[PDB]
Amino acid sequence: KRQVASGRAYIHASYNNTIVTITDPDGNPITWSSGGVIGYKGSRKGTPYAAQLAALDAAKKAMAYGMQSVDVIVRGTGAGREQAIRALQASGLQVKSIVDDTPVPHNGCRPKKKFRKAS
Amino acid sequence: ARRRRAEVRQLQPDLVYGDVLVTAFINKIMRDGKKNLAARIFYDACKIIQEKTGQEPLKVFKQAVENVKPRMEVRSRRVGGANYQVPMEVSPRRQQSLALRWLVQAANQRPERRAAVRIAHELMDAAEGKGGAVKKKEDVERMAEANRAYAHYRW
Amino acid sequence: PSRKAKVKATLGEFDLRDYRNVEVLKRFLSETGKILPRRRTGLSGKEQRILAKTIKRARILGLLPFTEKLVRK
RNA sequence: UGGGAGAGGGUGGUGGAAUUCCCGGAGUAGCGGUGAAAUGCGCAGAUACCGGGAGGAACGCCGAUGGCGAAGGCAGCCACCUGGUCCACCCGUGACGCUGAGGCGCGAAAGCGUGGGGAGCAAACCGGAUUAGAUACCCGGGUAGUCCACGCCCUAAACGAUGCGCGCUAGGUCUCUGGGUCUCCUGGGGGCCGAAGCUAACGCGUUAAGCGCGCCGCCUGGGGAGUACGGCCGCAAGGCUGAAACUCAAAGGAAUUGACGGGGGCCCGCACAAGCGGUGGAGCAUGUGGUUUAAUUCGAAGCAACGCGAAGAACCUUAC
Ligand SMILES: [K+]
Ligand SMILES: [K+]
Ligand SMILES: [K+]
Ligand SMILES: [K+]
Ligand SMILES: [Mg+2]
Ligand SMILES: [Mg+2]
Ligand SMILES: [Mg+2]
Ligand SMILES: [Mg+2]
Ligand SMILES: [Mg+2]
Ligand SMILES: [Mg+2]
Ligand SMILES: [Mg+2]
Ligand SMILES: [Mg+2]
Ligand SMILES: [Mg+2]
Ligand SMILES: [Mg+2]
Ligand SMILES: [Mg+2]
Ligand SMILES: [Mg+2]
Ligand SMILES: [Mg+2]
Ligand SMILES: [Mg+2]
Ligand SMILES: [Mg+2]
Ligand SMILES: [Mg+2]
Ligand SMILES: [Mg+2]
Ligand SMILES: [Mg+2]
Ligand SMILES: [Mg+2]
Ligand SMILES: [Mg+2]
Ligand SMILES: [Mg+2]
Ligand SMILES: [Mg+2]
Ligand SMILES: [Mg+2]
Ligand SMILES: [Mg+2]
Ligand SMILES: [Mg+2]
Ligand SMILES: [Mg+2]
Ligand SMILES: [Mg+2]
Ligand SMILES: [Mg+2]
Ligand SMILES: [Mg+2]
Ligand SMILES: [Mg+2]
Ligand SMILES: [Mg+2]
Ligand SMILES: [Mg+2]
Ligand SMILES: [Mg+2]
Ligand SMILES: [Mg+2]
Ligand SMILES: [Mg+2]
Ligand SMILES: [Mg+2]
Ligand SMILES: [Mg+2]
Ligand SMILES: [Mg+2]
Ligand SMILES: [Mg+2]
Ligand SMILES: [Mg+2]
Ligand SMILES: [Mg+2]
Ligand SMILES: [Mg+2]
Ligand SMILES: [Mg+2]
Ligand SMILES: [Mg+2]
Ligand SMILES: [Mg+2]
Ligand SMILES: [Mg+2]
Ligand SMILES: [Mg+2]
Ligand SMILES: [Mg+2]
Ligand SMILES: [Mg+2]
Ligand SMILES: [Mg+2]
Ligand SMILES: [Mg+2]
Ligand SMILES: [Mg+2]
Ligand SMILES: [Mg+2]
Ligand SMILES: [Mg+2]
Ligand SMILES: [Mg+2]
Ligand SMILES: [Mg+2]
């Protein structure tokens, strides 16, 4: 609708969902999808297939905006990360590159109990 | 089968089409080891197909089988409390076993009074792309993938 | 395995306390701002301990990075 | 005197990563969470993404199997103030030493007082699930507290559960830090395996749990009990000290052979799975339980009792 051509694809993988966001060359989102955006409602969202689908939903909706080439950026380490990547590559969009940018503190905040017991 | 890998036993070729695949179908038809009666039934069927069809029954038989073979199916597997229908490929060996089994089952579900008619008509509707057999095959494949979400539990 | 070559053998006579020689210091950081382990640096308990001090100093100055993005996956 | 290594301590600065919140942008319907869910958050536009700001707390990689400290403990980086300690020279004093009741000081976490500060986390607590219940485990919230300053408290599995000092008694191997004529010798630490020896074993073994001397502390069967009383200390919570009546024949340590595990690794069996045909449904036959009976003879009782003893009950048999 605005014609952007080339941009960024952000994969936010986690153990509960995969949410993809495509943005213009400088971070502003164009479209987005996720296990919830598509059918899946609960546990299924995490699954890699859902990731695959969301990834495709994202690209498809992005090509409408005239997208063609993307720069992928992966954040997260969920059960479905690597699938969204293979999804975008076969989506039609050209994967110019892949980069893992998962945030990691240099030891800041006391984690939730669920994420402790970690020496 | 905890030790070996129980090898598939070979069957004696057909006394007519000299086909092993035929003896097989005959075995499924057979009940109470009445292999004669089984044989007759199948043959009168190849005959009834010769009738309503100007094609060699052996070719119809094959085609039919082929259409009823499921190339995918769901298998249950317990993981984390609940059981999940995991779809997975279906070995050639089992496809054959499944196709023939269903043909006879579907055929005996039919309305025609005579056994031979049933196998005949089922065999035809089969090579055509219809019939209760082909449905089972389809209801199965539809079942698979309909659970593709769990395809990562390869099994 | 850790056998690509040790960063020490791959260098020449250099001052481990020179926090400005980003030219060489940089060769001690991974494909990320991360300080390489002795198995890779080829340095010693004492040498390695001084490097750290130096690197961190360069990081404060802006000459060296604290972290970088992995390029693949 | 000359040097050395160090998260040893105190003070003041300062850095980047992340979380939360706030502002702007862009974007749209879900996010989050679980075994599965719901509570919860989101069209007053959340989640995901970019930019800006605020604030508190902690310090990734290097980190080790490492280093420092009397113990408790101590991890960005920089400066200052300061403790301990190791080595070389063989220079000075001339037994000035060791231990150490009481005293004094230090003393993790939680907790207390006064005043600050609160990002994240989180006793209580408020809810959602689970469950037979679930005042729990899992999930969404959340106050004290966690952080700082001053005072307090003085406890711990404060552990090497091993008091301090000195002398003596094979060696191998890895490691940290000095010195050397830098194969490798030397000194001080940290580990492992082991001579002799020691030990109930397990194990310890120049970093003794060996062989010895010095001094301190402490034990004397279990329960009652770290309780009661008393004293001292404390704002409090409580701390230190610490019994008795009554009662038991044990309480314990190490190791052995087993059995067991919702421990691990291998591996079998119609064990499951894959199949094909059946039985719990009908009528009937037969055994049984239960009722009933003058008697319904007796035994068999999960598997491994139930068409079983009975491979022949009308009288006989049968014991009723
Ligand atoms: K909703
Ligand atoms: K012994
Ligand atoms: K008292
Ligand atoms: K024991
Ligand atoms: Mg989910
Ligand atoms: Mg220090
Ligand atoms: Mg920040
Ligand atoms: Mg905003
Ligand atoms: Mg909330
Ligand atoms: Mg709402
Ligand atoms: Mg609502
Ligand atoms: Mg609206
Ligand atoms: Mg931001
Ligand atoms: Mg604030
Ligand atoms: Mg030490
Ligand atoms: Mg300790
Ligand atoms: Mg000093
Ligand atoms: Mg002298
Ligand atoms: Mg003299
Ligand atoms: Mg003393
Ligand atoms: Mg004295
Ligand atoms: Mg204290
Ligand atoms: Mg405290
Ligand atoms: Mg307070
Ligand atoms: Mg306060
Ligand atoms: Mg919380
Ligand atoms: Mg229960
Ligand atoms: Mg309840
Ligand atoms: Mg909670
Ligand atoms: Mg300990
Ligand atoms: Mg040694
Ligand atoms: Mg030593
Ligand atoms: Mg040594
Ligand atoms: Mg011995
Ligand atoms: Mg013993
Ligand atoms: Mg022994
Ligand atoms: Mg030893
Ligand atoms: Mg000794
Ligand atoms: Mg001893
Ligand atoms: Mg003592
Ligand atoms: Mg005592
Ligand atoms: Mg007593
Ligand atoms: Mg007692
Ligand atoms: Mg007490
Ligand atoms: Mg008092
Ligand atoms: Mg008082
Ligand atoms: Mg107490
Ligand atoms: Mg007594
Ligand atoms: Mg023993
Ligand atoms: Mg035993
Ligand atoms: Mg066992
Ligand atoms: Mg077997
Ligand atoms: Mg067998
Ligand atoms: Mg079975
Ligand atoms: Mg019945
Ligand atoms: Mg009755
Ligand atoms: Mg008797
Ligand atoms: Mg009886
Ligand atoms: Mg029997
Ligand atoms: Mg009689």
Residue numbers in the entry:
A (entry chain K): 1 to 119
B (entry chain G): 1 to 155
C (entry chain R): 1 to 73
Publication passage describing the model:
The 2-deoxystreptamine aminoglycoside antibiotics bind to helix 44 (h44) of 16S rRNA, which is part of the decoding site of the bacterial 30S ribosomal subunit1011, thereby decreasing translational fidelity and inhibiting translocation. To study the structural basis of drug-target interaction we determined the three-dimensional (3D) structure of a number of the acetals and ethers in complex with the small ribosomal subunit of Thermus thermophilus. Two acetals, the parental phenyl derivative 1 and the most active phenethyl analogue 30, and two ethers, the 4′-O-benzyl ether 37 and the closely related 4-(chlorophenyl) methyl ether 39 were chosen for analysis. The overall structures of the 30S subunit in complex with all four compounds were globally similar to previous 30S ribosomal subunit structures (with RNA phosphate root mean-squared deviation of ~0.6 Å). Both acetals and ethers were found inserted in the major groove of helix 44 of 16S rRNA in a manner that resembles the structures of 30S–apramycin27 and 30S–paromomycin10 complexes.
The 4′,6′-O-benzylidene acetal 1 was synthesized and tested for growth inhibition activity (minimal inhibitory concentration, MIC) of bacterial cells using wild type and recombinant strains of Mycobacterium smegmatis with single point mutations in the drug-binding pocket. Similar to paromomycin, rings II, III and IV of all four derivatives maintained their interactions with residues in helix 44, showing that neither the acetal nor the ether modifications alter the fundamental binding mode to the ribosome. The synthetically added substituents of compounds 1 and 30, which result in a ring system mimicking apramycin’s bicyclic moiety, stacked perfectly with the nucleobase of G1491. Unlike all other aminoglycosides that form a pseudo basepair interaction between ring I and A1408 consisting of two hydrogen bonds, no pseudobase interaction was observed for the acetal series as a consequence of the absence of hydrogen bonding with N1 of A1408. The loss of this interaction constitutes the main structural difference between the benzylidene and benzyl compounds examined. For both the benzyl and benzylidene compounds (1, 30, 37 and 39), the 4′-O-substituent prevents hydrogen bonding with O2P of A1493. Acetal 1 induced pronounced misreading on bacterial ribosomes but little if any misreading on eukaryotic ribosomes. This unique pattern of misreading induction differentiates acetal 1 from both the parental paromomycin (misreading on both bacterial and eukaryotic ribosomes) and the comparator apramycin (no misreading on bacterial or eukaryotic ribosomes).
